[PDB]
Amino acid sequence: ANQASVVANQLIPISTALTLVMMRSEVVTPVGIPAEDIPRLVSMTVNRAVPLGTTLMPDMVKGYAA
Protein backbone atom coordinates (compact mmCIF):
# COMPACT_ATOMS: atom_id res chain seq x y z
CA ALA A 1 0.00 0.00 0.00
CA ASN A 2 2.08 3.06 1.08
CA GLN A 3 5.40 1.60 0.15
CA ALA A 4 7.71 4.35 -1.26
CA SER A 5 10.20 3.61 -3.95
CA VAL A 6 13.21 5.43 -5.37
CA VAL A 7 12.20 7.44 -8.45
CA ALA A 8 14.64 9.12 -10.86
CA ASN A 9 14.54 12.77 -10.11
CA GLN A 10 16.43 13.47 -13.29
CA LEU A 11 17.74 11.34 -16.15
CA ILE A 12 20.46 9.12 -14.88
CA PRO A 13 22.99 8.51 -17.70
CA ILE A 14 24.45 4.96 -18.16
CA SER A 15 27.55 4.04 -16.10
CA THR A 16 27.07 7.09 -13.90
CA ALA A 17 27.35 6.94 -10.15
CA LEU A 18 24.17 7.88 -8.25
CA THR A 19 24.25 11.04 -6.24
CA LEU A 20 21.57 12.21 -3.77
CA VAL A 21 20.05 14.88 -6.14
CA MET A 22 19.39 12.16 -8.71
CA MET A 23 16.70 10.42 -6.59
CA ARG A 24 13.42 11.20 -4.95
CA SER A 25 11.02 9.07 -2.86
CA GLU A 26 7.45 8.45 -4.17
CA VAL A 27 4.66 5.86 -3.71
CA VAL A 28 4.55 4.26 -7.18
CA THR A 29 3.21 0.95 -8.55
CA PRO A 30 4.88 -1.53 -9.24
CA VAL A 31 6.99 -1.11 -6.08
CA GLY A 32 10.74 -0.78 -6.72
CA ILE A 33 13.83 -0.36 -4.57
CA PRO A 34 12.56 0.88 -1.07
CA ALA A 35 13.20 4.64 -0.40
CA GLU A 36 15.08 3.66 2.79
CA ASP A 37 17.94 2.49 0.54
CA ILE A 38 18.81 5.84 -0.99
CA PRO A 39 21.94 6.40 1.27
CA ARG A 40 23.03 3.00 0.30
CA LEU A 41 22.61 3.64 -3.45
CA VAL A 42 24.87 6.74 -3.40
CA SER A 43 27.73 5.93 -5.78
CA MET A 44 26.46 2.64 -7.19
CA THR A 45 26.13 2.68 -10.96
CA VAL A 46 23.15 2.06 -13.09
CA ASN A 47 23.46 -0.34 -16.07
CA ARG A 48 20.97 1.42 -18.29
CA ALA A 49 19.92 5.05 -18.70
CA VAL A 50 17.06 5.79 -16.26
CA PRO A 51 14.66 8.48 -17.64
CA LEU A 52 12.98 11.03 -15.47
CA GLY A 53 10.20 9.56 -13.34
CA THR A 54 11.31 5.90 -13.78
CA THR A 55 11.19 3.76 -10.54
CA LEU A 56 14.64 2.32 -9.93
CA MET A 57 14.20 -1.44 -9.91
CA PRO A 58 16.82 -3.85 -8.35
CA ASP A 59 18.01 -5.10 -11.73
CA MET A 60 19.17 -1.63 -12.89
CA VAL A 61 21.82 -0.98 -10.20
CA LYS A 62 25.02 -2.85 -10.49
CA GLY A 63 26.08 -4.31 -7.15
CA TYR A 64 22.60 -3.93 -5.58
CA ALA A 65 22.00 -7.00 -3.51
CA ALA A 66 19.56 -6.50 -0.60
Q: What is the DSSP letter of 56?
A: P
Nearest-Å Rg of the Cα atoms of the chain is 10
**Overall resolution, Å:** 2.6
The domain made up of 1-66 is a member of CATH 3.90.1210.10: yes
Q: Identify the bridge partners of residue 55 per DSSP, sorted by sequence position.
A: 7
Which residue numbers come right before each break in the chain (C to N over 2.5 Å)? none
* Method by which the model was determined: X-ray
**What are the DSSP calls for 22-56, one per residue?**
GEEEE--SS--SBGGGHHHHTT-BBSS-B-TTPBP
User: Please, what is the Cα angle at 22 between 55 and 1, to 5 degrees?
Assistant: 35
Smallest CA-to-CA distance from 50 within 5, 21, 4, 9 is with: 9
